[PDB]
């Protein structure tokens, strides 16, 4: 088990096995308290050194009975992206990385005039999932999301 400590001292427990990765811990945290992975900044306690992703937690300073510090970086600044419809026509959308794919699809539905259940969005080959935030996919200013039609 692992203690996660937040600013102002709220603490909670995370149990890790059988692998012990930083990406696993972050997914654990999301499930426990709802903070998206892309927003999590984790450091070893009390040293305050940032955890490294590509390194197993056992290989850093962390085993059972250790404490990690979580600071939440909101990452909510507006940016603009492009969604390309099925006809090849790209249109800009103002978004924030903390909004859901579902929310972006409501925007695309409105502009394109296609019901949200009749399409899905992709980015860099992989599907965007309704319940996840845009920040999970690493969208940048004027990245192109593609719209794909269902049957």
């Amino acid at each position: 088990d692992l203690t996660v400590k937040m600013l102002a001292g709220n603490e909670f427990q995370v149990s890790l096995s059988s692998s012990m990765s930083v990406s696993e811990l972050k997914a654990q945290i999301t499930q426990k308290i709802g903070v998206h992975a892309f927003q999590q900044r984790l450091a070893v306690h009390p040293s305050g050194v940032a955890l490294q992703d590509r390194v197993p937690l056992a290989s850093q300073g962390l085993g059972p009975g250790s404490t990690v510090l979580l600071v939440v970086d909101k990452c909510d600044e507006p940016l603009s992206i492009l969604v390309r419809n099925n006809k090849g026509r790209s249109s800009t959308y103002e978004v924030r990385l903390t909004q859901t794919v579902a929310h972006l699809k409501q925007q695309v539905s409105g502009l394109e005039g296609v019901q949200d259940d009749l399409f899905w969005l992709t980015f860099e080959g992989k599907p965007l999932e309704d319940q996840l935030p845009l920040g999970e996919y690493g969208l940048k200013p004027l990245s192109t999301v593609f719209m794909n039609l269902r049957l």
Binding site: M6, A8, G48, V71
Partner: protein, 96 residues
């Protein structure tokens, strides 16, 4: 207009954070940069916080009662951690 749910400990946390905010208003004021409406917001926040610290201190036991001055120090550390996004700024804002 997007609220974030919170537990019991946010009340004490906010008093300390906002004590930190006061300390920065005050330090800014010594730079002769704080305009007149700004100085009213300073004095206002000091009064509200003083009444909030006195209300909170009565509900809590003796060993956890903190004065305005000691709460300022905790808020400053919290603010350092956030401004740099670095717990090392920092460390005691998390309560080790």
């Amino acid at each position: 207009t997007t609220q974030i749910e919170v537990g019991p400990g946010a009340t004490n946390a906010t008093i300390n954070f906002e004590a930190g905010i006061l300390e920065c208003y005050e330090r800014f004021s010594w730079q002769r940069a704080l305009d007149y409406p700004g100085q009213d917001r300073l004095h206002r926040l000091k009064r509200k916080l003083e009444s909030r610290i006195k209300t909170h201190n009565k509900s809590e036991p003796e060993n956890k009662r903190m004065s305005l001055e000691e709460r300022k120090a905790i808020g400053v550390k919290m603010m350092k951690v956030l401004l740099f996004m670095d717990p090392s700024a920092g460390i005691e804002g998390f309560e080790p």
